[PDB]
Structures are given as C-alpha cells and as structure tokens.
Amino acid sequence: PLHSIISSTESVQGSTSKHEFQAETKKLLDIVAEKEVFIRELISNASDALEKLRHKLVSDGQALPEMEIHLQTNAEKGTITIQDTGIGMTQEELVSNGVGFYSAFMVADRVEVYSRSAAPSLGYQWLSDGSGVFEIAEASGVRTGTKIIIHLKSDCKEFSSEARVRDVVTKYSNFVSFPLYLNGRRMNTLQAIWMMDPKDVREWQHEEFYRYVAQAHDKPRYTLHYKTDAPLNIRSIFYVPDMKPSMSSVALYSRKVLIQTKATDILPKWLRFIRGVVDSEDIALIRKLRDVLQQRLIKFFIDQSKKDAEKYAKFFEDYGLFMREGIVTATEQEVKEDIAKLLRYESSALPSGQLTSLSEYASRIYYLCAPNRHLAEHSPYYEAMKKKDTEVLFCFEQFDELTLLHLREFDKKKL
Numbered sequence: 001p002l003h004s005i006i007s008s009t010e011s012v013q014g015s016t017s018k019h020e021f022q023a024e025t026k027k028l029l030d031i032v033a034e035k036e037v038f039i040r041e042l043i044s045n046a047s048d049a050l051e052k053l054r055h056k057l058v059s060d061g062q063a064l065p066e067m068e069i070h071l072q073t074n075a076e077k078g079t080i081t082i083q084d085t086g087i088g089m090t091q092e093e094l095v096s097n098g099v100g101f102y103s104a105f106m107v108a109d110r111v112e113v114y115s116r117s118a119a120p121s122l123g124y125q126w127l128s129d130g131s132g133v134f135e136i137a138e139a140s141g142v143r144t145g146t147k148i149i150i151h152l153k154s155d156c157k158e159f160s161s162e163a164r165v166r167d168v169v170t171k172y173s174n175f176v177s178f179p180l181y182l183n184g185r186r187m188n189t190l191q192a193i194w195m196m197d198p199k200d201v202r203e204w205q206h207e208e209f210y211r212y213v214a215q216a217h218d219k220p221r222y223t224l225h226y227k228t229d230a231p232l233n234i235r236s237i238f239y240v241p242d243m244k245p246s247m248s249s250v251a252l253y254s255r256k257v258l259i260q261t262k263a264t265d266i267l268p269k270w271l272r273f274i275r276g277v278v279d280s281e282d283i284a285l286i287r288k289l290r291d292v293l294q295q296r297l298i299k300f301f302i303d304q305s306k307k308d309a310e311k312y313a314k315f316f317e318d319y320g321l322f323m324r325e326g327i328v329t330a331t332e333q334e335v336k337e338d339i340a341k342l343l344r345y346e347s348s349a350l351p352s353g354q355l356t357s358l359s360e361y362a363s364r365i366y367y368l369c370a371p372n373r374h375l376a377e378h379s380p381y382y383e384a385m386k387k388k389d390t391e392v393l394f395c396f397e398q399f400d401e402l403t404l405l406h407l408r409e410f411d412k413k414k415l
C-alpha cells in the first residue's frame with residue numbers, strides 16, 4: 001500500500017510580483033547564509049496548521065477531511081518537499097514577514113511555496129532565493145493547505161536521499177498528532193501521553209510507554225506524571241525501574257517534537273536513574289527547570305515512603321547509592337538536606353529490619369561504622385553510648401560515612 005498526495009498540480013498563469021524583505025528579515029537571512037533540525041521545525045508548523053484547522057471544523061461540525069503531513073524526496077531534482085493539508089496561508093500572511101523560515105533557508109538555495117487558505121480564497125506561489133527578494137503570484141491547481149518545495153543547497157544535498165531522512169523523522173517527529181508519511185510510507189506515531197491529563201492515563205498505557213522511552217522489558221516500580229503550568233509549561237512523565245539497578249536519560253520534548261534525546265543536566269546527577277520524558281513549550285533556563293523538577297521528584301519519594309513504606313524500602317536498598325552521591329556532590333546545604341529526608345537507616349530503636357529516618361530521630365545525632373548489626377551491637381564506642389543515654393544510628397554501609405560527613409548536618413543537628 002503506497003499512499004501520498006504530492007505531485008505538481010500547479011501552474012502560474014499570471015506573472016509574479018517581486019517584493020523586498022523588511023530591513024531586519026534580511027540581516028538574519030544572510031548571517032544564516034545543528035543541520036538536520038529544520039525538518040523538525042517544518043513538521044511542527046505543518047501539524048500546527050492542521051490543529052488550527054481541525055479545531056475549526058468541529059466548531060461547526062461538518063465531517064473532517066483527510067488530514068495528513070507528507071514528505072517527498074527527489075533524488076534527480078535534488079529536492080525535499082513537505083505538504084500538509086492544514087488551514088493554509090493567505091496572500092497577506094505570505095507577505096507579512098515564526099521559526100521555520102530560517103531553517104529551511106539554512107539548507108535551501110531556494111524555496112518554492114504553494115499555499116491556499118481553507119476559507120472557500122485562491123492559491124498562491126511564493127518564490128525566494130534567500131536574497132532580499134521574494135516573488136509571489138496567484139497560482140492554478142494549488143491544493144488546499146500548503147506545499148513546501150526546497151531545492152537544497154549544493155552542500156546540504158544529504159537530506160535529498162531517503163535513507164538519510166528516516167532517522168531524522170523517527171528521532172524528532174515520532175509523536176506528531178497527525179499522520180506523517182515519508183514518500184507515502186506511513187511513519188509511525190506513538191501517542192504522546194505525557195500531554196494528557198494525569199487522571200486519563202491508564203496504568204497499561206504508562207507501561208507501554210516506559211517500555212519505549214527506557215528500552216526495557218519490565219514494569220516501572222513507580223510512576224510520576226507531573227503536569228503543571230504555574231512555573232513553566234511542563235507535560236512530564238517519570239518512571240523508576242522495578243528491579244535492582246546493575247550495569248540523565250529523560251528525553252526532552254517541546255510540543256511533541258524532540259529537542260534532545262538524552263538530556264544531559266536536565267535533571268540532577270544523582271537522578272540519572274530516571275527515564276521517562278520532560279516536555280515544555282519554552283523551546284541557562286535549564287538551571288531553573290532542573291532545580292524545580294528536582295523538588296517535585298523529592299516530593300514524590302518523601303510521599304511514596306509515606307504511602308507504602310515497604311515498596312520504598314525495596315527501592316531504597318536498590319537505589320540508595322545515588323541518593324548518597326546526591327548529597328556528596330550537591331553543594332547547597334538545603335538541597336543536600338532535602339535529599340537526606342529520603343535516607344533510611346538501622347538503629348537501636350528496633351531489631352534488624354528497622355529503617356528509621358533521621359527526620360524521626362527527633363525524639364532526643366550519633367552514627368557508627370559498618371556493615372553488620374553484630375560489629376555494631378558490640379563496639380567499645382557503641383557500648384560507650386549504650387551505657388550512655390543517647391540512641392545511636394547504625395549506618396551499616398560504607399559510603400554512608402562520606403555521605404553523612406559531606407552532609408555535614410541535618411536540620412542544624414550535629415549529625
């Protein structure tokens with residue numbers, strides 16, 4: 001089954017009318033005159049076009065048309081073509097000076113455009129060779145929506161071969177909310193469920209997605225679907241893998257098209273065990289986004305350990321290492337402090353199997369060496385405190401020492 005709609009149905013009966021770009025549109029259209037980015041942009045607009053249309057037909061409500069996004073390559077003409085069937089542009093929009101303009105030209109020696117607005121409006125050609133002048137003529141045979149043809153620069157002819165284009169689409173445009181055909185071959189779309197409302201995402205749907213974003217074969221031991229608009233637009237999903245970890249990677253999205261796939265320092269360093277996905281509508285800022293996500297995660301765990309102390313304990317043995325690096329490698333004491341509220345430790349208050357949290361040691365901090373309750377339960381330094389009043393805290397882990405020393409205190413407590 002081959003299915004694409006892209007062919008030359010157009011002609012310019014009349015004759016074009018050259019224009020000038022405004023004084024500014026020039027000075028960026030020449031500083032520009034990394035590299036694969038532009039299709040991600042062009043796919044975006046071609047969707048956004050279609051969304052704006054769909055949203056307007058249901059308004060009144062006569063049955064929807066075909067709504068696709070197509071991409072065509074030409075080996076012998078050296079071209080690439082993207083035609084959505086969206087709401088389209090009118091003649092005025094065509095002349096009024098908005099991302100995709102500068103990326104298409106960053107690869108094109110010359111762009112060709114066939115737009116036509118949905119309002120039953122004529123169709124127009126739009127030519128430009130990246131110099132200050134763009135012709136625009138009424139054109140015959142234009143199909144509703146917007147075709148974009150690009151005769152690629154001499155040196156950027158790579159995007160002209162199909163074997164090179166597929167990865168760019170699979171990478172960035174795997175979640176566009178309308179069908180997307182490369183050469184009429186349907187390109188996959190998974191559902192971007194991180195956009196949805198946390199209540200409407202079933203449990204089975206999270207799993208299917210965890211299995212994708214993490215390349216795994218199990219379920220997620222925890223799930224966090226953080227959707228909030230107050231600080232920044234975020235539509236996020238977090239998953240912690242179930243079993244014990246043995247040898248960041250949250251993807252980074254903006255309005256369903258990928259920016260960065262292995263987002264480094266989107267999350268802290270001690271949170272590098274989270275997969276899932278952060279999405280925003282905001283394209284140095286990250287040093288604000290990383291800190292605010294850090295808080296929501298710490299929340300989620302402090303409040304898991306409130307929900308179900310057994311699942312948490314299983315997790316804190318599996319992943320307590322990162323939590324320690326968190327406090328040794330974090331520099332600002334309140335962040336270290338807020339991570340310690342996740343540490344659980346064995347202590348004199350119950351037999352082996354007592355995880356006390358330091359937070360609860362507020363009954364009255366002393367701590368001892370490792371690793372077994374026997375070398376702890378008879379240590380001349382321990383028993384010195386067993387004849388003494390205070391309750392000691394038993395670390396039983398070796399890197400716990402450096403954690404609890406680099407965490408130089410807790411809640412202004414000696415530690």
Ligand SMILES: O=C(c1ccc(O)c(C(=O)n2cc3ccc(OCCC[PH](c4ccccc4)(c4ccccc4)c4ccccc4)cc3c2)c1)n1cc2ccccc2c1
Nearest residue numbers: 042045046048049052084086087088089098100101113146
């Ligand atoms: O990239 C394209 C292209 C390709 C195919 C198309 O078929 C269209 C098209 O006809 N569109 C109509 C739209 C209408 C709205 C829209 O959405 C974008 C503009 C409105 P926005 C926004 C504002 C600022 C930045 C981004 C979006 C939004 C953003 C995010 C989510 C939802 C809406 C909004 C906000 C509030 C109310 C109403 C609209 C996108 C639209 C795309 C454009 N180029 C590049 C060219 C270079 C040279 C020559 C020809 C070229 C064509």
